[PDB]
Design goal:
Bound molecules: 1-{4-oxo-4-[(2S)-pyrrolidin-2-yl]butanoyl}-L-proline, 1-benzyl-4-methoxybenzene
Strand content: 15-25%
Shape: globular
CATH superfamily of the largest domain: tricorn interacting facor f3 domain
Distance between the termini: 34 Å
Cofactor: Zn(2+)
Radius of gyration: 25 Å
Helix content: 25-40%
GO cellular component, one term: ficolin-1-rich granule lumen
Structural class: alpha+beta
Subunit structure: Monomer.
CATH architecture of the largest domain: Sandwich
Strand order of the largest sheet: 5-4-8-2-1-11-14-13
Number of strands: 22
Family: Belongs to the peptidase M1 family.
InterPro entries: Aminopeptidase_N-like_N (IPR045357), Aminopeptidase_N-like_N_sf (IPR042097), ARM-type_fold (IPR016024), LTA4H (IPR012777), LTA4H_cat (IPR049980), M1_LTA-4_hydro/amino_C_sf (IPR038502), M1_LTA4H (IPR034015), Peptidase_M1 (IPR001930)
CATH class of the largest domain: Mainly Beta
Number of domains: 4
Number of helices: 19
């Protein structure tokens, strides 16, 4: 009903229908300049003004029907930005529309953008720009109702230096030389499917593409295009599986974009162009589960969207569920349970890090006066998945629940819903099983902190080997280390190898002699898998092995994935032999880190 993260007019007052973006990317000044034409529809009678979200934006003028109108910026409200009130030249009746062209310019401190210098890229000769609007950063790029309760289509014309390429979360609609400047190109984009504004994405740089499917192009710098094309070859197979689970894919194109290492997330479900971290380039497709996850957002998240960020679990919860069904269809049901059981372990970590009582461990959170970037964690992913997984086992198994999910996506397609909307449809769909649903502790699952009230049933086939080897190392004495050998891993996949470290890491610290012996027989230092290397180094740093200090500092700074960089920095700061280096390394790299990551890493290290 009320979006406590937005200062703009609610959807009950007016709602944006379309956005026409005409801007120019200036790497000299690190700014976006142009006009944002918002087609606004009134939701009440005698509407004479509205408020929009902005964050560090410069408003030159606001034109309506070819005339300038009066506008005013309120005082800034911290992360929410500054509200922008506009005086309409006419009063609108209900359902009447008007087009508001706003001339704007971004600040180099835009929390949605990161500007890279040539030395920060692979080619080393051209700059790079990419955007991250989710959750409420789009207001830092252009004025808008920065709330997932409004969905709009958009067309865009972006001007960039001719030697560079621009891509957006839309269907490419041609390129032509800038008629005003021979040194620039203009790339045209159109997104015919209405989306919440947080799915607005832009990227500019020396980008090349490689076709890996009938509807998928992999984009990155020349140095990673081929490496990326192989890593994500399963994309089309996952799109077909996703189509079988959630219905037709309605976005036309599904391209991939591998960004520089400073990308904060593993992936971003930007429509038509998923952004992914280069840390997925393991060389064996072992991390392609993130691709399945991002593909699933084409239904759960982008089609059926959370009305507010309090109900973020709807987006991620069902997305993880779809993702793990896609991997199950590709590698077997036992693999689905293996990952499901592993996700429960991550949920254990998040609750133990926040605390059994922390409000952020609730499935549905109250973000009033809370920066979404500060509450973001695995809770909505795993606790949300555990609920759906719990409901699957409670209502008749995966076949039955997938039927509900497909009907759920068709029921709320192109719309924004709340948790109660989802709960109601669950009761409507399973009307013949309300007696089973009433046995569910909806208050504990949806609004209670800590671990869920009940744990689902997990198959242990693929996990036992991990627990076996993990228990050996934890209980091992000094005269037992000699019996460990590289042969211990001959039948363990990369995922089992990663889960073994996760289980072992839960009982850290280990004796310093155990860690040294582990590297001697297992040689984990030589593994480039970011997931495995991340946990191996955490085990080392937490076990007080000084040799691992430079390794952890290098991984924590040579890439910017918050999943890895934040825990690495925290672990290094808690190690007395590396505390000073950790704070120093952050301070020297702070200026060139991603704006969101730099803020969170500063708070984690208590240097803010
Ligand atoms: O479902 C996704 C991305 C998944 C993503 O990368 N996640 C989610 C938890 C950990 C983290 C990561 O892999 O770095 C998006 C991403 C951020 C908000 N929405
Ligand atoms: C990564 O982008 C997001 C998306 C959503 C949120 C808000 C939130 C966080 C944690 C739990 C519930 C809701 C923050 C950041």
């Amino acid at each position: 009903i009320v979006d406590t993260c937005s200062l703009a007019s609610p959807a009950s007052v007016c709602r944006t229908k379309h956005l026409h973006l005409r801007c120019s990317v200036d790497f000299t000044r690190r700014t976006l300049t142009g006009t944002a034409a918002l087609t606004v529809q009134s939701q009440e009678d005698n509407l004479r003004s509205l408020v929009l979200d902005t964050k560090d934006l410069t408003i030159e003028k606001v034109v309506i029907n070819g005339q300038e109108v009066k506008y005013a910026l309120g005082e800034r409200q911290s992360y929410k930005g500054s509200p922008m009130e506009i005086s309409l030249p006419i009063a609108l009746s209900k359902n009447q529309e008007i087009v508001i062209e706003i001339s704007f310019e971004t600040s180099p401190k835009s929390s949605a953008l990161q500007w890279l210098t040539p030395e920060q890229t692979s080619g080393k000769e051209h700059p790079y720009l990419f955007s991250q609007c989710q959750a409420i950063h789009c207001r830092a790029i252009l004025p808008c109702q920065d709330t997932p309760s409004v969905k709009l289509t958009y067309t865009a014309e972006v001007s960039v230096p001719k030697e560079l390429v621009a891509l957006m979360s839309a269907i490419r609609d041609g390129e032509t030389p800038d008629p005003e400047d021979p040194s620039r190109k203009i790339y045209k984009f159109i997104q015919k499917v209405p989306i919440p504004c947080y799915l607005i994405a832009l990227v500019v740089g020396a980008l090349e593409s490689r076709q890996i499917g009938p509807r998928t192009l992999v984009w990155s710098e020349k140095e990673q295009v081929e490496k990326s094309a192989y890593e994500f070859s399963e994309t089309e197979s996952m799109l077909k599986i996703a189509e079988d689970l959630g219905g037709p894919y309605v976005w036309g194109q599904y391209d991939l974009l591998v960004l520089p290492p400073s990308f904060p997330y593993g992936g971003m479900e930007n429509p038509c162009l998923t952004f992914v971290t280069p840390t997925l380039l393991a060389g064996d497709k072992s991390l392609s589960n993130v691709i399945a996850h991002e593909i699933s957002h084409s239904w759960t998240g982008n089609l059926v969207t959370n009305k507010t960020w309090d109900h973020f679990w709807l987006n991620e919860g069902h997305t993880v569920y779809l993702e793990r069904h896609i991997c199950g269809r590709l590698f077997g049901e036992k693999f689905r349970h293996f990952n499901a059981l592993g996700g429960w372990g991550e949920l254990q970590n998040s609750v133990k890090t926040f605390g059994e009582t922390h409000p952020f461990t609730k499935l549905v959170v109250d973000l009033t006066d809370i920066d979404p970037d500060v509450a973001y964690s695995s809770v909505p992913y795993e606790k949300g998945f555990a609920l759906l997984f719990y409901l699957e086992q409670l209502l008749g198994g995966p076949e039955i629940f997938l039927g509900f999910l497909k009907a759920y996506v068709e029921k709320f397609s192109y719309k924004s819903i709340t948790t109660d909307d989802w709960k109601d449809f669950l009761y409507s769909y399973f009307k013949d099983k309300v007696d089973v649903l009433n046995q569910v502790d909806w208050n504990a699952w949806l609004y209670s902190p800590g671990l869920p009230p009940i744990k689902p049933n997990y198959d242990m086939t693929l996990t036992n080997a991990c627990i076996a080897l993990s228990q050996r190392w934890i209980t091992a004495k000094e005269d037992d280390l000699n019996s460990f050998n590289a042969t211990d891993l001959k039948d363990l996949s990369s995922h089992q190898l990663n889960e073994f470290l996760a289980q072992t890491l839960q009982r850290a610290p280990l004796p310093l002699g155990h860690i040294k012996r582990m590297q001697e027989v297992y040689n984990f230092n030589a593994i480039n898998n970011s997931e495995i290397r991340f946990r191996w180094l955490r085990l080392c740093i937490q076990s007080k092995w000084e040799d691992a200090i430079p390794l952890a500092l290098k991984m924590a700074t040579e890439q910017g994935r918050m999943k890895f960089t934040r825990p690495l920095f925290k672990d290094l700061a808690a190690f007395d032999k590396s505390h000073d280096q950790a704070v120093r390394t952050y301070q020297e790299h702070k200026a060139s880190m991603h704006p969101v990551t730099a803020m969170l890493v500063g708070k984690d290290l208590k240097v803010d």
